Design a protein around this ligand. Structure first.
Ligand SMILES: Nc1ncnc2c1ncn2[C@@H]1O[C@H](COP(=O)(O)O)[C@@H](O)[C@H]1O
Ligand SMILES: Nc1ncnc2c1ncn2[C@@H]1O[C@H](COP(=O)(O)O)[C@@H](O)[C@H]1O
Lengths: 338, 347, 329, 347
């Protein structure tokens, strides 16, 4: 059992990767709520251009991690995601984002609960591209049966475990008949001969995007390749309030890394203490449930859930006037009386 | 001044005061939705005679081709206005763009007066590359369980879309023009698109160029549609196909109200993007608004400003106020019939 | 007691050169019955047949160079049966004038992959990309086949031909996997590499240094034809194709002879010799040992040999000398 | 008339009667093999002064670059003559072609008088594409155990090689010009190459265009080298790299006698293709013949016909007759030293 999560006499050793932007602040929020609840976990915390190595190496020891987002350049001599590098190198191939609306938050369409599972290592995130002659560029998008059967089962397994009734494959198979075709088939194919209790279906990514914005309640679980998941993800992010309310987690066979489900760095508001830690904390609770704690998780989630439902004292972006600092302390406060 | 890039070559038919325009009534609700437009156009005294043609496909060399009758017609009159058609061996709409050199999809989504949807003050404009990108035919089975779909991005194809976007943004008085991309993980592909905009940026100094990741383009638009009411967003084929169908979802919750314009170098086709609605066909329940707005788009593209503004600013846009008007799709009680005369009144 | 083998005469001298074998076969009363097929996309029926019989004997089909031409369908046959290994036997023959004599080398090529993967596209007009696939599984396979083959036929050396200095991933993978699994398995055999261009030069100038050569699809066509020339010509080369389940035997040189079709000038040594390879395979081989000595002695014995070796006899006459020598063994 | 495609822009240095040529002695047997050429050139009164330069690579941006001294020199004098150099992070020879726009390898292999090899009457000429093809840097790991090497073939790159071939075939009075290919299984890639030749064929009516599969090109050449003594074969990068090293194997059994010419649009470099022979270096055993013949191919490229024919038709080619001459590599007993004076005599 050199394959479970680092643990010494009752104390887990989890990896902590604050990362860029509001990362550093939003992580801290969790630390504080954690020691204030005296949760038996010790952070091994790392900071970083190619030491994305040290993040990997750490996670390989501890098996479990909690992280924010790193920043990614758009220029030509920029380094490349290294958010994806982390996942590819650990084969943490499954991303789960949780879009469930929250009581104390004004949203245009209310009472919404949908999940978006995307494949992390393949698709348009395969990062294979070249320029044949000057001015002509080809980006190769890889889709393989093995990686696809994998995510397909993860999605169904997930839907079964969390009593989700419907699983829908998002694709563009009418145009990319081989690539997205393979994806759509393999999913529906193995949702019929295994997992027969679950409702499998397909939807074309563009039309999916339209229903998502106009009539989102029709969706339950969505399985997508790397790209479509970024897109449906952000639709879902908006639908429920914003990137600060979305819990997320990444799964591989051996490792698990928990991050915000919306995937925004918040570079612009770094150090301003204006940021919203709901995202980080909630996916932090996801991690607790994972490493079996979850008395704590059930706990500290109710804390933040009630805090934000309870009008003012909530953070800027939800419609409040409180700072990250103040919002955190209301949670730790509500928590101290449970 | 209309955009230099897809410029109409006017010339009204010297024998009549009028310009010639190919129709393509299309099938399904096409016929009814169509003459609905012919009437409204008549009433406003549009310098336009209709040369309707049929795009039902031939199959020269197994590869689906489009009939000579319709080709000659459309290449002649440099403009056409098609309604919806069914699904007859090579996408009908695809061989339609390939045979007429159409390369840019223009998709506006604006809130409609007197039709309440969940999102408000949404006024959006998006130009989409409709030539290459994710949607080139190129895909390969590299071995047993492994597939490659190939996304193609070239400067030549990018340049001329990004241009039409700057020039269209200018032609409708929007200051900002946003290049949606993902240079983050598609460094070369999307990077080229972005650089080509950044380089063109300079020969259009009246407009301001911004760059955004679809990440944010979708996040921000859904949280607050109006932040892009001074928009015009340009983007490669896929991001475009999704964002435009999304934008429509914001504006109207479906796309029975959405008009599209397919701009080519010398030709250009203007169509409604809804389907053939075969089950409502003949019963006079269709809703011309969609095609009708594409007519306006066409008018402007042709230079007939005054008529376009006439048929849009007044009429339809205004007659869609009062539930006795409207159609079944908008709570209204009116027929295609009554909508058309009810329109022409304020015409 | 009676095998049912597939017979695919194919294009060019195919039809004549196969017949030569038929005649020598019934004249030796060999217990095999030909199921014989003829053909644009009925390359299906060849496959389907071989799937029943498992074994076949064939000539070469013709392949267009024009754009709307159909595509090899020699490779189609192999890919669809996963007959992934080609063996060509370049051993010089006694009665044949060659520039460098006493030469004995074998060229094993992979059939289904490499530059024969037939993946290509035109991005913009005038720009064409042909994709060359190389995969570990298909490569480990041929690598072992080659060594297994070398062990079975007491060959001491196996050399991998590649261009790994330029195509560092593609041919790199090939060179590694070969040398890699010639070291931890098959340690008794001498593994080495050679760069395809330099290999081509040694082959023409100093061929005796080579024993067995393993190559991807392309380099095998090239070294193949060098070897073909070295020993006399395409008419003297026995060949065979192997998969897990099936085996198809064809000439080792791979030329159609379209120009001399129906002229009865052609040389059947190739066909017959690879025909003997097939006998050894399905266990006969008393016959094989036999009818090979027949043709070997026939051609060594001066005149009565066929045009291209330096004789003046026709396919017909050469055949009958074999059946004649054979009738007195 | 020399080939229009890689035309030398003469201009002898007005202060001296002479033309300027960069040397690049190179290392190993380079120095000795080099001044061997300088002397023989002197004696024949060649209008040429040597501006020797050093191509030892820099490393601007991790990517290996070639020194400014040598760049300026070589771009100036539109021609250079390099001997062999060692293996110093980006092929030295590659960054040499990329920085000087060299795109065509010209490789002749002719039997040598008085040196007996197994093949006879071999007189071969081959032009090779040295830009793209199998040898573009493009390869990908599409997943765990799967690799793609990408062969690139364009009309632009093909056109200008195939041209130089027609024009070179004309310039040396060979009737036939053969396009080696494999359109059989590389339909598009090799097909494009072939069509581009077939289309160019027409604007060179004095030459006859044939097309051959490497299959036969290698079969036929080895069975009978002379069938191509009216040759000039053009082919894509890989077939070229192999056939040329093969042709040399036929002509001399090694390539210690083979000269190459690397033609660029305005520049052009002429080199010997043998190695640095570090173990024979200094002892005066090298064999200038190789480089020497590249000098000849340079002379012709420059227009100095009379001198080239002089140094080739007589000299070396003729002095390599009599084993008291020759070098160790050809059974001979002579030194690099004695070969050079023994040459100049019949010079
Ligand atoms: N942690 C966060 N929680 C909530 N909203 C955020 C967060 N980070 C960024 N945002 C919002 O998203 C926008 C920038 O997103 P990004 O794409 O991460 O730069 C800003 O306008 C913020 O309002
Ligand atoms: N049976 C045969 N015996 C001798 N040479 C042959 C035979 N079949 C084909 N060839 C040679 O191969 C060439 C035909 O192949 P190809 O030109 O590739 O179609 C001819 O030039 C013949 O010289």
């Amino acid at each position: 059992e050199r394959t479970l999560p680092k643990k010494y006499g009752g104390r887990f050793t989890v990896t902590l990767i604050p990362g860029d932007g509001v990362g550093k602040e939003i992580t801290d929020s969790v630390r504080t709520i954690f020691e204030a609840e005296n949760i038996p976990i010790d952070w091994e915390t790392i900071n970083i251009k190619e030491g994305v190595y040290e993040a990997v190496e750490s996670l390989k020891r501890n098996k479990i991690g909690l992280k924010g987002l790193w920043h990614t350049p758009a220029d030509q001599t920029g380094h490349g995601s290294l958010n994806v590098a982390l996942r590819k190198q650990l084969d943490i191939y499954a991303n789960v984002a949780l879009f469930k609306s929250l009581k104390g938050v004004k949203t245009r369409i209310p009472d919404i609960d949908l999940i978006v599972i995307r494949e992390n290592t393949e698709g348009e995130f395969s990062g294979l591209e070249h320029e044949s002659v000057p001015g002509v560029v080809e980006s190769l998008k890889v889709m393989t049966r093995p990686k696809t059967e994998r995510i397909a089962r993860f999605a169904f397994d997930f839907a079964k475990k969390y009593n989700r009734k419907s699983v829908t494959a998002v694709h563009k198979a009418n145009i990319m008949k081989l690539g997205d075709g393979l994806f759509r088939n393999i999913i529906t194919e193995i949702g019929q001969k295994e997992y027969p209790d679950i409702d499998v279906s397909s939807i074309i990514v563009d039309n999916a995007s339209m229903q998502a914005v106009a009539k989102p309640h029709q969706f339950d679980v969505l399985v997508t390749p790397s790209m479509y998941g970024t897109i449906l993800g952000n639709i879902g992010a908006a639908l429920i309030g914003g990137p600060g309310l979305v819990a997320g987690a990444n799964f591989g066979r051996d490792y698990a890394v928990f991050e915000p489900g919306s995937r925004h760095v918040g570079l612009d508001i770094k150090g301003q203490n204006v940021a919203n830690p709901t995202a980080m904390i909630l996916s932090s609770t996801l991690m607790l449930n994972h490493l079996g704690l979850n008395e704590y998780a059930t706990r500290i989630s109710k804390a933040v859930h009630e805090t934000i439902a309870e009008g003012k004292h909530t953070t800027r972006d939800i419609g409040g006037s409180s700072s990250t600092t103040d919002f955190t302390n209301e949670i730790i406060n509500k928590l101290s009386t449970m | 001044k209309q955009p230099s890039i897809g410029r109409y070559t006017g010339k009204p038919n010297p024998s009549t005061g009028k310009y010639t325009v190919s129709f393509i009534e299309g099938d399904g609700i096409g016929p009814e939705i169509s003459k609905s437009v012919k009437k409204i156009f008549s009433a406003a005294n549009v310098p336009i005679e209709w040369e309707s043609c049929d795009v039902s496909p031939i199959f020269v060399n197994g590869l689906t081709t489009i009939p000579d009758p319709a080709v000659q017609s459309i290449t002649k009159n440099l403009v056409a206005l098609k309604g919806p058609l069914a699904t007859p061996h090579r996408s009908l709409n695809l061989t339609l763009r390939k045979t007429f050199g159409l390369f840019a999809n223009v998709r506006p989504a604006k809130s409609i007066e007197g039709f309440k949807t969940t999102y408000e003050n949404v006024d959006l404009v998006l130009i989409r590359e409709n030539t290459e990108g994710e949607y080139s035919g190129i895909e390969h089975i590299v071995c047993p369980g492994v597939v490659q779909s190939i996304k193609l991005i070239t400067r030549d194809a990018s340049e001329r879309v990004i241009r039409y976007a700057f020039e269209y943004a200018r032609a409708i008085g929007r200051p900002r023009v946003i290049v949606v991309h993902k240079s983050t993980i598609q460094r070369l592909a999307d990077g080229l698109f972005v650089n080509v905009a950044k380089e063109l940026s300079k020969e259009y100094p009246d407009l301001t160029l911004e760059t955004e990741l679809i990440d944010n383009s979708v996040l921000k638009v859904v949280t607050n549609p109006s932040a892009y009411t001074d928009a015009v967003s340009v983007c490669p084929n896929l991001y475009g196909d999704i964002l435009s169908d999304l934008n429509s979802g914001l504006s109207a919750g479906s796309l029975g109200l959405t008009p599209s314009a397919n701009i080519g170098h010398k030709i250009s086709i203007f169509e409604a993007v809804h389907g053939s609605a075969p089950d409502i066909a003949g019963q006079d329940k269709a809703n011309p608004t969609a095609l009708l707005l594409s007519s306006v788009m066409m008018l402007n593209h042709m230079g007939l400003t005054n008529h376009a503004d006439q048929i849009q600013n007044a009429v339809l846009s205004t007659i869609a106020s009062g539930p006795e008007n409207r159609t079944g799709d908008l709570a209204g009680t009116a027929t295609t019939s009554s909508f058309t005369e009810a329109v022409i009144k304020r015409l």
